[PDB]
Amino acid sequence: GSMTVRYQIEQLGDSAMMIRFGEEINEQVNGIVHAAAAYIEEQPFPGFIECIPAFTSLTVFYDMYEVYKHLPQGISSPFESVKRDVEERLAEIAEDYEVNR
């Protein structure tokens, strides 16, 4: 069974984002979520704070000041703007077929 993973983005707390992908048959995620921490830090946004790999999920911390600096018209939430900054990096690995919007 081939799939492009089923990952979901939730709100961490106030100004942080955590994204879980798939597993069991997702060595892609299992390895990339570990590297994604570094993936984001190599291609980050000026308000990036921290990113910790949670086995199949990304706990992504950042500064809302820089995301508000973006906050595109339609984006109603700081973390929601960040999704895009990470998406353009993330999506290209698989999830571009999904896009959490």
- Beta strand residue intervals within 1-101, DSSP E: 8-11, 16-20, 48-53, 57-62
Per DSSP, 66 falls in state H
Which experimental method was this entry solved with? NMR
User: What does the alpha-carbon distance between residue 96 and residue 88 come to, in Å, rounded to a whole number?
Assistant: 8
CATH code: domain 1-101 is: 3.30.1360.40
Q: Are 68 and 78 a contacting pair, CB within 8 Å?
A: yes
Task: For tokens 């077929």, name the residue.
Answer: 97
User: What does the alpha-carbon distance between residue 81 and residue 101 come to, in Å, rounded to a whole number?
Assistant: 10
